[PDB]
Design a protein around this ligand. Structure first.
Ligand SMILES: Cc1cc2nc3c(=O)[nH]c(=O)nc-3n(C[C@H](O)[C@H](O)[C@H](O)COP(=O)(O)O)c2cc1C
Ligand SMILES: CCOC(=O)/C(=N\O)C(=O)CC
Length: 364
């Protein structure tokens, strides 16, 4: 089974290639990591296995879901440290995903009820609705388009959050540059209508992600930084006229950052365009993998068979699993044994209970 051959992800010696994909679960009450998160990640940790956390706030304006953790305060750092310690005791490697939602937010999630921030004034359309803290669904508002001073402040928020992640004991961080969130709102020409140095051309649209990645690489080292993108995705009105060219432009910049830094990033993590909340889709994935000088993690709709094939055929080095990892704490072992998998319950993906639908899915 190729999923159980070891893999050197830079300095990290992994014993298998099954990765816990980053998943927002909304148990981090008041944006503080809770003991429940420790039990959840401990359940899923394996010796030499790689885990990526739920998206984690970099600042008070970065959230668009209820009860998602932050890593911008010392209180949050202190509580993450307990979670990281229990995962490390199982021998796992764990990265914290740094997440800013940009315009995918609501007044209820913003300090003082202010407008969310974005590259543009364009709102997500009413085809999409935002989950509210009471379980109803609301309307995405018009965001505020930020200037270059505020852009530099957001870059600094990523940099400080990366340092805070290292202080908490994380092995590294992942930049959430995917899925129509803040970074993708700069990348995608269906969103970014700017006329300054951050829009107007593909090169300008890539400026923001480039600066974010350079800042975190400078702070913690390239080998502790992963980057997630999704150039082709049906999520929150985040479309590009040329997804493959957009992806390749991002890859070129990551390759150049590595050459400048003298070290490779931890990895590039790419969402299969099939995933929502063909050979054109497989065309895109393999084209980006072949273009990138480093470790490639694929995600989105993978199964045991599809993950085996991806690694066997050279399409990916690591395979991240989301939904099946929700309901199978021992997913790694089940994949190794080809054991039957448990169903997952969408109704408890984003509820707040520390146990129900979170840590009470059974082991084999
Ligand atoms: C409930 C849920 C929460 C998710 N949260 C995040 C997130 O916070 N950050 C992110 O990059 N992807 C997130 N994803 C996407 C997953 O990381 C992953 O790519 C996807 O679940 C893989 O497809 P699969 O569920 O078929 O394995 C989430 C997915 C689900 C189902
Ligand atoms: C569909 C692609 O977008 C995602 O997977 C995602 N976050 O990145 C969420 O669903 C947040 C809960």
């Amino acid at each position: 089974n190729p999923l159980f051959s070891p893999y050197k992800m830079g300095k990290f010696n992994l014993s298998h290639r099954v990765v816990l994909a980053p998943m927002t679960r909304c148990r981090a009450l008041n944006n503080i990591p809770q003991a429940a998160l420790g039990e959840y990640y401990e359940q899923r940790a394996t010796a030499g296995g790689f885990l990526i956390t739920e998206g984690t706030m970099i600042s008070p304006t970065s959230a668009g879901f209820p009860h998602v953790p932050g890593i911008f305060t010392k209180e949050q750092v202190r509580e993450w440290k307990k979670i990281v310690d229990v995962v490390h005791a199982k021998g796992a490697v764990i990265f914290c995903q740094l997440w800013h939602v940009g315009r995918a937010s609501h007044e209820v999630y913003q300090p003082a009820g202010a407008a969310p921030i974005s590259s543009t004034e364009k709102p997500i359309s009413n085809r999409w609705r935002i989950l509210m803290p009471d379980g109803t669904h609301g309307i995405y508002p018009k965001p505020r388009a930020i200037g270059t001073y505020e852009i530099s402040q957001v870059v600094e928020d990523y940099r400080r959050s990366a340092l805070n992640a290292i202080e908490a004991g994380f092995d590294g961080i992942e930049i959430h540059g995917a899925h129509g969130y803040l970074i993708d709102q700069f990348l995608k020409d269906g969103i970014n209508d700017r006329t300054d140095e951050y829009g107007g051309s593909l090169a300008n649209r890539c400026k923001f992600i480039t600066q974010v990645v350079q800042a975190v690489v400078s702070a913690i080292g390239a080998d502790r930084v992963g980057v997630r993108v999704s150039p082709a995705i049906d999520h929150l009105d985040a479309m590009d006229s040329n997804p493959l060219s957009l992806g390749l432009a991002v890859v070129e910049r990551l390759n150049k950052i590595q050459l400048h830094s003298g070290s490779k990033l931890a990895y590039l993590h790419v969402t299969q365009p099939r995933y929502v909340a063909e050979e054109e889709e497989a065309r895109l994935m393999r084209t980006l993998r072949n273009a990138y000088q480093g470790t490639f993690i694929c995600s989105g709709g993978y199964t045991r068979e599809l993950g085996i094939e991806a690694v066997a055929q050279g399409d990916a080095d690591l395979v991240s699993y989301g939904r099946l990892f929700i309901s199978n704490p021992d997913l790694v072992m089940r994949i190794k044994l080809n054991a039957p998998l448990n169903k997952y319950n969408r109704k408890t993906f984003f509820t707040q209970d520390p146990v129900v639908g979170y840590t009470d899915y059974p082991f084999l």
